[PDB]
Amino acid sequence: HARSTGSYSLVTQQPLGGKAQFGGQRFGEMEVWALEAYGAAYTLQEMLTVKSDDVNGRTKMYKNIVDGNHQMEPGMPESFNVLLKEIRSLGINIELED
């Protein structure tokens, strides 16, 4: 199986799972630990912000790749905003300072 850019899930803007659904492989938690264990920092940043979640980040990425640029505009994971809405939907007031 192989995937460049397919469909995206609805509640958390991440790619779908499986093969029949044209999906991408789960860059799981222990692989995140194994990239923290090297000094690979930009590889992990695009591995969990640009390639996966941030929608404006990945459209900027796709334009930059088809123009030869090779550069990422990072932004924020949208699933972290989902975490803010689920914690905020309790009586808890989570924010982002400064």
Binding site: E36, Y38, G39, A40, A41, Y42, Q45
Partner: peptide, 16 residues
């Protein structure tokens, strides 16, 4: 703030 990003976090911690 460990690997390649330790220079970035040095820069951000210096520029506060």
């Amino acid at each position: 703030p460990a690997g390649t990003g330790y220079a970035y976090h040095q820069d951000r911690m210096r520029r506060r």
